[PDB]
Paper text:
The human AAA+ ATPase p97, also known as valosin-containing protein, a potential target for cancer therapeutics, plays a vital role in the clearing of misfolded proteins. p97 dysfunction is also known to play a crucial role in several neurodegenerative disorders, such as MultiSystem Proteinopathy 1 (MSP-1) and Familial Amyotrophic Lateral Sclerosis (ALS). pmcp97 is a member of the classic clade of AAA+ ATPases and is an essential cellular enzyme. p97 is composed of six protomers forming a homo-hexamer with an N-terminal domain (NTD) and two tandem ATPase domains D1 and D2 (1). p97 is an essential protein in regulating cellular homeostasis from membrane fusion, Endoplasmic Reticulum-Associated Degradation, Mitochondrial-Associated Degradation (MAD), Chromatin-Associated Degradation to NF-κB activation (2). Critical functions for p97 include the translocation and restructuring of proteins from large cellular structures such as organelle membranes and extraction of ubiquitinated client proteins to facilitate their degradation through the ubiquitin-proteasome system. Here, we present cryo-EM structural analyses of four disease mutants p97R155H, p97R191Q, p97A232E, p97D592N, as well as p97E470D, implicated in resistance to the drug CB-5083, a potent p97 inhibitor.
In the p97R191Q, p97R155H, and p97A232E mutants, the primary variation in conformational outcome as compared with p97WT is observed when the D1 and D2 domains are both occupied by ADP. In these mutants, the ADP-bound conformation of the D1 domain displays many of the structural signatures observed only upon ATPγS binding to p97WT, suggesting that these mutations shift the conformational equilibrium toward promoting ATP binding. R191 is located at the start of the linker connecting the N and D1 domains, surrounded by negatively charged residues, in particular E195. R191 may stabilize the “down” position of the N-domain by maintaining an extended loop conformation in the linker. A unique aspect of the mutation-induced structural changes in the ADP-bound state of p97R191Q is a dramatic ordering of the linker connecting the N and D1 domains into an α-helical structure between residues 190–199. This structural ordering is observed in p97WT only when ATPγS is bound to the D1 domain, which arises from changes propagated at the other side of the linker proximal to the D1 nucleotide-binding site. The dramatic shift from extended linker to an α-helix upon loss of charge by mutation from arginine to glutamine appears to confirm the vital role R191 plays in stabilizing the “down” position in the N-domain of p97WT. Further inspection of the structure of p97R191Q in the ADP-bound state shows a shift in the local conformation of the loop region between K425 and L445 of the D1 domain that is located at the junction between the N and D1 domains.
Author numbering:
A (entry chain B), B (entry chain C): 12 to 707, 728 to 775
The structure:
């Protein structure tokens, strides 16, 4: 149902794909099962497609040289007639045609060097033997007995139909050899295949340019204003340029890149003309798309504003932004590293009204990126990218590419360094045999410095309700406040009641106040932003409470999202607590939190969860009806609950069936959730210690649990429970109102 | 009486307006009831008007093709012969005339492309069949069997009278094709129809330019100086440019737009001439109006003042501001985003003395804006804009336009995306059938980020005296201090007494101290500015008490207005309270509040209301006679009052008649106003929970009230009442003076 519409696979028209061992283009293997199961007939020029309708046509029935069944092709498939994996191939033979005239020839480098003379008898005639070299009208074929570097691309479409080529014609050398950027631009045309971790961003960007470009006559009949400015965000290395180029090449529009420092490096007044001519050039080449690589490098008019040359550039950019009154179908796009480093004049309407934030990829997103830079080379059988994505959390789209490059380089000076043959022409049987293993990646991760550690991680937690031992009572509570308003908004407006905006978790430390916040976000399939105690203390020690604004601004744009404040009372303990200073309980950070919470629109799906260990020092100003109406108390696990905590924490450890967990939970009375986790950690440590000592077995037995028992820790005593008990009844006060029965 | 003078409706000369299904201009339907009830006679050219005297004249009696009764017209009415809804149409036939010569022809694009030859036999002669194409002297007619894009506008008025045109004449191609701005400028001519939420601003702006422009000889005989500079305010997106253009086009004066960055993007010294020539150009084109789009971008001489080029521009603007000694009837207008970002030299007299503040539209104002951008497209029957205006409070005039654009786009990729027919000529039977529903708006609101959240909301509260349960004693008190001085100023000056400047509300929290402040503003039909506790704490933590000045400056300009300070003692609790620090009760924020309150003119209708929960920590310096003379105590509701609180909070919830509210209020003794509201909220939550559980009924029954009773909360105990009781008698002290009788 969900993925039923995406069914395009399990088609009989498929073929096997392997590595290459042969470098001869004139000798092509023959496949037996394909000629029997399928309907592929005989023919010189076959009309096949699959990737931008660009494949290679070769003559077959030249087998019985190397091997049977398995087919062998050249190693040019890495770049030619193939962009990446996952692309389908459609082959449909078109036999019984007549013989055409010929196709032209495009010299590359082999014609300039060397005497021409006649160009036929030199190396063209003595190369035809039962092979007419079928050439299409834009295909790329590579055949040469040696240096092997030749391309082919035509631009003049003389013949309309398809026929069979023939040798012994008249050719010339009046072609235009294409350079490498014309080949790379084809590879940049990416819809989703070579973009990882940016599914949502593409779904929002492509919809803004699909309609106004491919259907210009759509908005001309309906009173809708298409967007003019699209601003992209993300830390440097995310891939803001790659996405912009891929969308432009996919839509097929005139793309004019405007680099940041390229304009700013010009003379006095010349940069005033480079910007001016760029837009008028795109006007005549309509439809067109315009992208600015570095926008903060052109107009950083926030605090800097120095000099009479750069302000003039900013004013020119502003004038050329609101002055595009329709005219042509051109969309201006730009990229920057930080929302703060932008001219506020560009944030208005008509210049850059649509903002697209491209965040750091999550564990699932980073997995897809690894498959993009590792498709041109093969890997060992014991190489999995699933653990690599999990082990790299602070990496961006370029950090993974650098990691792959370093992993590939490690294998070079570990297997090839022993050859000790300094030759300018190294044998090709070594590079192809180079296989990158897990050991290369282990060193590469250890030597790679991530560039996305300070950024707030905004992902979807992988923890679910099964990882929370027991505590079944509050699971229904959380599902009844954040899921109901998002599934049935009509019911809340029917009664006139407004849904709650937040819930506060109070109780003894180490009981699950964070697992509850993460599991509900996992179930709701929403983002999760965690604010730690040290994060709050940093903004209080530095006298910078204005940083709370970005916390809420990042959250409301990334809707739906939940916002979690761990140990919200961390500042109250720092300034005292039960005694405290000469003031009450009201600081700058919580004041700003309240100010931003009051101003939040209740319609948007942004839920706030607060956690605390000392409810006695919580400011009562946060519990007024409207900010945190619901208070949930998490008690210590009972006999019923501690059993599930062990069954959840031991899923990753091979614990034998001999161990009795029910008896284990019985004696552990004054133990919280965190108390039971360290017991398992110390027990698992003993197994590792015993294994290492016995090296000079794979399962943990019962004795390790008994030995780790001597170091039991009870972080929650009976004294601190008493205040929670007396505080719960203080907030409850339901005496006398228990028996409230209406007379009639 | 109030709206009796505005009666222009219920005229028999009306017609039905519907959608379009036909695209043929030569075939026009015929209306039977209009030819019977009205006096519309037969004629080729009919003298009709209704919107700038611009309509279309067509020949009728070509019906009996599609349908009867209902008439069908072309889809050009969206832009031609119509600007917006609410405009009246007057049709008066003028029959029995003679045949005129002809009207000229204006080519647009169909004459340049293609051979002309004779231009008559090609496509002009074989298109006349019982239709002479009646053409007026400035009408716009569109008829073409195909691409359908042609305009018509004459500028040469050769014939004075009106006659009947005839074909078979001599024409030429020496006309000037008009471009799109000449068509858009007509649509910009808006009095009130296409401006929403700016009734008061237009009433103040149009009166400043109506007299000096339309009646130049008025101020020449009376010793009155007309204004020269009008400054407009508002956050970006409010519509400062649209209002300025609409007034200029309505008054019919030479309008010369001067953009901000347009001047600042010029070379060294060129911008000195662009400004200079603009005023002398307007001098000869008198009367004229001059508008500056970005004034802060030209003269931000407040702190920046860097460079010898921009200061010269500021000095030139200043010189060309006070140097307009009458000369011609030109008025210079400008717009900016913030009062702080302006050169104080422009605030003097003779340059910009009149300041017009254009605020964010209220709920009523935003409703009118939605009807402006949704008039060119039809909506579904279940589409109401009343709830959209209420649900969007932080939106500006452009945020609503963007919201409408996004709502229109959502319907495109939800109903049309299933066609899967990528054709350059999409069928016209799909776009017209596209109906935007509530579901599109629900997603559009959730995905739209408002740009007016940080701005202080200054509106008129919708709450009235009926929403305040009981508390009849103080309702008369508030009506006797803020309404008497504004209705009978003579009575106060007769006795020499000066009216009070403010009233302080003290009592237990959650009793109605805010509803009382809002209801009196609602009854007085005045603005309401609310200052929350966190707002006061922000200016105390940041050591920035100078922000209190804008609070009073925004208030006195927006007269009449009331100013409300919620929990005025919020800073006293933050620095201690009953014990406090080593000082008394005097901080920077309250000191600045007193300084600004003393300096306020008592003549202007600006009333200040203070609210507090801890009167024991209130600075006595604010209760001196002259700042807050009157102190009103709000006690807990008694048996008489709690009944009305329930009857007011349950008006939005379908509560059955089974529930006994009188018995409900009887047992609830120590419950305040806020205590009873959460009971209703939790009870309404149970109905939603039960409905959702029973999905896998519409009325709330009595059992939910009984079940929610177990979670009763008494935020106000008996201990805190005692201090209020002992404080009221402390401030009263009326012992011995109860029996004061004059002897004789
Ligand atoms: N989402 C991604 N998918 C694939 N490659 C990526 C991605 N993000 C970054 N990269 C890699 O990073 C390199 C540089 O990215 P770049 O376009 O420079 O981003 P930016 O310019 O915003 O820093 C690209 O060549 C690409 O290989
Ligand atoms: N019900 C539970 N299920 C699983 N782990 C728990 C549970 N309660 C506590 N823990 C352990 O406590 C650790 C931290 O949990 P957390 O809720 O953050 O404690 P606290 O709420 O005191 O911060 C987790 O790593 C988890 O193993
Ligand atoms: N009061 C209003 N009525 C109608 N449209 C408005 C209003 N305010 C803003 N807009 C919309 O905003 C757009 C123009 O914004 P504008 O007023 O130019 O911004 P600024 O005021 O900063 O120049 C118009 O398309 C208009 O529809
Ligand atoms: N007399 C009353 N009528 C209606 N609602 C009341 C009344 N008293 C208190 N409330 C409820 O209390 C809430 C806030 O009242 P408010 O006056 O702000 O309390 P406080 O004065 O303590 O701030 C409102 O939601 C309102 O419904």
């Amino acid at each position: 149902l969900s993925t039923a519409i995406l069914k395009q696979k399990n088609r009989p028209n498929r073929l096997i794909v392997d590595e290459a061992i042969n470098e001869d283009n004139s000798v092509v293997s023959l496949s037996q099962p394909k000629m029997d199961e399928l309907q592929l007939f005989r023919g010189d020029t076959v009309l096949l497609k699959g990737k931008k309708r660009r494949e290679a046509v070769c003559i077959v029935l030249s087998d019985d040289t190397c091997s049977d069944e398995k087919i062998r092709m050249n190693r040019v498939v890495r770049n030619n007639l193939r962009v990446r994996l996952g692309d389908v191939i459609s082959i449909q033979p078109c036999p019984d045609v007549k013989y055409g005239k010929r196709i032209h020839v495009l010299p590359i480098d082999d014609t300039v060097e060397g005497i021409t003379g006649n160009l036929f008898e030199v190396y063209l005639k003595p190369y035809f033997l039962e092979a007419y070299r079928p050439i299409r009208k834009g295909d790329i074929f590579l055949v040469r007995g040696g240096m092997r570097a030749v391309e082919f691309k035509v631009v003049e479409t003389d013949p309309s139909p398809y026929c069979i080529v023939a040798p012994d014609t008249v050719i010339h050398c009046e072609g235009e050899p294409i350079k490498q950027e014309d080949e790379e631009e084809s590879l940049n045309e990416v819809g989703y295949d070579d973009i990882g971790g940016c599914r949502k961003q593409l779904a929002q960007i492509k919809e803004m340019v699909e309609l106004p470009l491919r259907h210009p006559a759509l908005f001309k009949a309906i009173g809708v204003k298409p967007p003019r400015g699209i601003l992209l965000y993300g830390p440097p290395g995310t891939g803001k340029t790659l996405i912009a180029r891929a969308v432009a090449n996919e839509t097929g529009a005139f793309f004019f890149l405007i680099n940041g420092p390229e304009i700013m490096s010009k003379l006095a007044g010349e940069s005033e003309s480079n910007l001016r001519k760029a837009f008028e050039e795109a006007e005549k080449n309509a439809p067109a798309i315009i992208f600015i690589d570095e926008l903060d490098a052109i107009a950083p008019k926030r605090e800097k504003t120095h000099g009479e040359v750069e302000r003039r550039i900013v004013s020119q950019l502003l004038t050329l932004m609101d002055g595009l009154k329709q005219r042509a179908h051109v969309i201006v796009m730009a990229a920057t590293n930080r929302p703060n480093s932008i001219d506020p004049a560009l944030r208005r309407f008509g210049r850059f009204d649509r903002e697209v934030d491209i965040g750091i990829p999550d564990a699932t997103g980073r997995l897809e990126i690894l498959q993009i830079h590792t498709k041109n080379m093969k890997l060992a059988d014991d190489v999995d990218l699933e653990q690599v994505a999990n082990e790299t959390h602070g990496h961006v789209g370029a950090d993974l590419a650098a990691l792959c490059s370093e992993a590939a380089l490690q294998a070079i000076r570990k297997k090839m360094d022993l050859i000790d043959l300094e030759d300018e022409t190294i044998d090709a049987e070594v590079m192809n045999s180079l296989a990158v293993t897990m050991d290369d990646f282990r060193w590469a991760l250890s030597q790679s410095n991530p560039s996305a550690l300070r950024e707030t991680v905004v992902e979807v937690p992988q923890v679910t309700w099964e990882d929370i031992g027991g505590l079944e009572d509050v699971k229904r509570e959380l599902q009844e406040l954040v899921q109901y308003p998002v599934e049935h908004p009509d019911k809340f407006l029917k009664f006139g009641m407004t849904p709650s905006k937040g819930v506060l978790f109070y109780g003894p430390p180490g009981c699950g106040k964070t697992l509850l916040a993460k599991a509900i976000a996992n179930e709701c399939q929403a983002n999760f932003i965690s604010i730690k105690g040290p994060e709050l203390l940093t903004m209080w020690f530095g006298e910078s409470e204005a940083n709370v604004r970005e916390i809420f601004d990042k959250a409301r744009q990334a809707a739906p999202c939940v916002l979690f404040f761990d140990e919200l009372d961390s500042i109250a303990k720092a300034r005292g607590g039960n005694i405290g200073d000469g003031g009450g309980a009201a600081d700058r950070v919580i004041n700003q939190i309240l100010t931003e919470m009051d101003g939040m629109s209740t319609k948007k799906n942004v839920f706030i969860i607060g956690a605390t260990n000392r409810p006695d020092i919580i400011d009562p100003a946060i519990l007024r009806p409207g900010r945190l109406d619901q208070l949930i108390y998490i008690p210590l696990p009972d006999e019923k609950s501690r059993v599930a905590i062990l069954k959840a924490n031991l899923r990753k450890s091979p614990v034998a069936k001999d161990v009795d967990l029910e008896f284990l939970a019985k004696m552990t009375n004054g133990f919280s959730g965190a108390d039971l986790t360290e017991i398992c950690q110390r027990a698992c440590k003993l197994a590792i210690r015993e294994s290492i000592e016995s090296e000079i077995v794979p399962e943990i037995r019962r004795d390790h649990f008994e030995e780790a028992m001597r170091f039991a820790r009870r972080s929650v005593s009976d004294n601190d429970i008493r205040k929670y008990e007396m505080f719960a009844q203080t907030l409850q006060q339901s005496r006398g109102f228990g028996s409230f029965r209406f007379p009639s």
